[PDB]
Amino acid sequence: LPMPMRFRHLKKTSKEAVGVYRSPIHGRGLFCKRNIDAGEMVIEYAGIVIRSILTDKREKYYDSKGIGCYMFRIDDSEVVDATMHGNAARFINHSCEPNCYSRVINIDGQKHIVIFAMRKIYRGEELTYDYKFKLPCNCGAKKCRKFL
């Protein structure tokens, strides 16, 4: 189906497809509640598209209030701040053998970060994507890069 058609009514279907639980990779993670077909649009990384130059001061503010800072870097100029207006996608952990990938899509003039299933994902599995950004990696994959 064309990309703009696939983006419509994710809020309703993502509440039934995924859930947030403790993760053995790190803290909390996103897990699937039912089998997700390969190529399927899982969830949007919801939040506010902000200027990248403002992330340093925004993260400093959040850290000073004891509020966890959830951000997804679009490019050198833009970042999605999911701290206040986010959804369950903000808990997606990194893996060197991910079952998901991130993409910046443009729907009716507006930018959205969406998560796609790279293979069929089975009930109970944690959803992961490759983070592009040393920090030690705990994905546990055979072909682990050992750092994020």
Residues that bind ligand Q2M (CB under 6 A): 23, 25-29, 68-70, 91, 93-95, 137-139
Minimum CB–partner distance for residue 22 and ligand Q2M (Å): 9
CB of 146 to ligand Q2M, least distance (A): 10
The distance of Cα 24 from the centroid of its chain, to the nearest Å, equals 17
Place of tokens 């994902």: 121
Is position 144 annotated in a ligand binding site? yes
SS (H, E, C) 34-77: CCECCCCEEEECCCEEEEHHHHHHHHHHHHHCCCCCCEEECCCC
Residue whose Cβ sits closest to ligand Q2M: 27
Stretch near Zn ion under the rule CB under 5 A, chosen from 64-72, 92-100, 102-110, 122-130: 92-100
Q: Of 15 and 63, which CB lies nearer to ligand Q2M in the complex structure? A: 63
Ligand-binding site membership of 32 (annotated): no
**Is residue 148 part of the contact set for Zn ion (CB under 5 A)?**
no
Q: Is 69 annotated as a binding residue?
A: yes
Cβ(52)–Cβ(76) below 8 Å? yes
Phi, psi of 59 (to 5 degrees): -65, -35
Residues in the chain, total: 148
Give binding residues for Zn(2+) as ranges.
139, 144
Give binding residues as ranges.
28, 69, 94, 139, 144
